């Protein structure tokens, strides 16, 4: 197996070396890694939803037919600015939105353990390749060795 040298705190190269771990030969699979990362990244999300009573706690019933105006329910009463205005509708101002967001949306997603381990092994193998690091954007032009190993 290939061996990688150990670099000390002073930037030198020590005599001790490590044989290359098998994981650095793992199949680099960008599509599988992206799909697993897509799923895993959603497991830290917090639920959000509008108030379940939002748009309902008013009082408004339809005025009827033949009124020369739309049949959307309108707030009752009088003397106030809100009286006569429509309610109970996604189109209506201060009305409930269409399909109010709920908390029991599927926020978390299950990933097979073997698929997760496949992605992690490929990620480590990808980290052990210089060209992938340059595409990643890391300024490693003068890094002495990849993979980089430092003493204890």
């Amino acid at each position: 197996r290939p061996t990688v040298s150990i670099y000390n705190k002073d930037g030198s190269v020590s005599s001790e070396t490590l044989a290359l771990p098998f994981v650095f030969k793992a199949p680099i699979r960008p599509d599988l890694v992206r799909s697993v990362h897509t799923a895993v990244a959603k497991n830290k999300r917090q639920p959000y939803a509008v108030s379940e009573k939002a748009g309902h706690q008013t009082s408004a019933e339809s005025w009827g037919t033949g009124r020369a105006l739309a049949r959307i329910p309108r707030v009752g009463g009088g003397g106030t600015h809100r009286s006569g205005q429509a309610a109970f509708g996604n189109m209506c101002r201060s009305g409930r939105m269409f399909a109010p967001t709920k908390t029991w949306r599927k926020w978390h997603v299950k990933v097979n353990q073997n698929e997760k381990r496949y992605a992690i092994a490929s990620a480590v193998a990808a980290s052990g390749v210089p060209s992938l690091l340059l595409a990643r954007g890391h300024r490693i032009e003068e890094i002495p060795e990849v993979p980089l190993v430092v003493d204890d």
Partner: protein
Amino acid sequence: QQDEVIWQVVGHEFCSYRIKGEAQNFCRNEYNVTGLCNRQSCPLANSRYATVRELYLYMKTIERAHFPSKLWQRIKLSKNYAKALEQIDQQLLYWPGRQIHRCKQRLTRLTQYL
């Protein structure tokens, strides 16, 4: 891992030197020979190539490609535009002759810059 898998992850889409637009993409790589996305021109995605910048010339080979610090070797030319053409083409005779013309032309344009 290898040249082609590096290409299919890096060269096609993912690279810090890709500039996509309406229907085209360009190469900011300080190592590329043509400035375009190709198997013939990407040194990340293929073995030993050579390139010129402002004039210092990068050269590569495979046996020490695992060591990034000494991976890219630099030779400096500060004599003449015509002279530089001889060093560039002489050091690419024994090397794949496809990109000698592109490298020479880069020398000519960049000397025109100077």
